[PDB]
Design a protein around this ligand. Structure first.
Ligand code: CO
Ligand code: CO
Lengths: 116, 116
């Protein structure tokens, strides 16, 4: 997989996730069409492939979902749906920043969360 | 593929083929390295995939190689190496513009060419 995504396009992808946090389930976030919506948004892009953008998100950006400045309820619900584990460091980061105590399963999967 | 190549990038791909015609065999044109060399030339491209570019050239641009403003010898040598058949119309176009009479086999494959 020889794919090179620019940092500006990564930022655009994170903004595309954040603005649609209210309507993003886990399954929809991983569909090519959700990213094709981002590709359709900006013309003057020489190469547009929703398949490639989705692969880049799944391979290089999903791990960084916790650190993202978006709605914390939507973020954690996505982390639960896709079964993305939170480490101790990421869990305490979420507590100290998004002000949420996350109840995790044994494997580290997001099970629930409480406020402050 | 869900790939959308801008017309400017297609023109850039043809220019990349034409200006490298002196170093273009049949195999090298169909290598991901050649299109990766194209992609490395222009930064500020948000999405770079040599695999995607090679697929697009092979599926949407190799059919139109005959009419390209390109070195005639290298053009015909590529058409021969890749066993790309020439129709009668394209044959006469090559005759009338590149001034080359092309000897083709029964299947339409380029066998040789001579001056007019
Ligand atoms: Co794939
Ligand atoms: Co392939």
């Amino acid at each position: 997989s020889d794919v090179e995504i620019s940092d500006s396009f990564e930022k655009a992808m994170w903004n595309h996730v954040s603005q649609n946090a209210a309507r993003l389930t886990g399954k929809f976030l991983m569909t090519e069409q959700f990213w094709a919506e981002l590709l359709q948004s900006q013309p003057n892009i020489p190469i547009k492939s929703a398949h490639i953008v989705l692969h880049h998100f799944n391979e290089m950006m999903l791990e960084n979902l916790w650190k993202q400045a978006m709605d914390p309820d939507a973020k954690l619900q996505i982390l639960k749906d896709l079964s993305v584990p939170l480490s101790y460091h990421q869990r305490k980061w979420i507590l100290d920043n998004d002000r949420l105590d996350v109840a995790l399963s044994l494997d580290g999967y997001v099970v629930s969360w409480d406020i402050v």
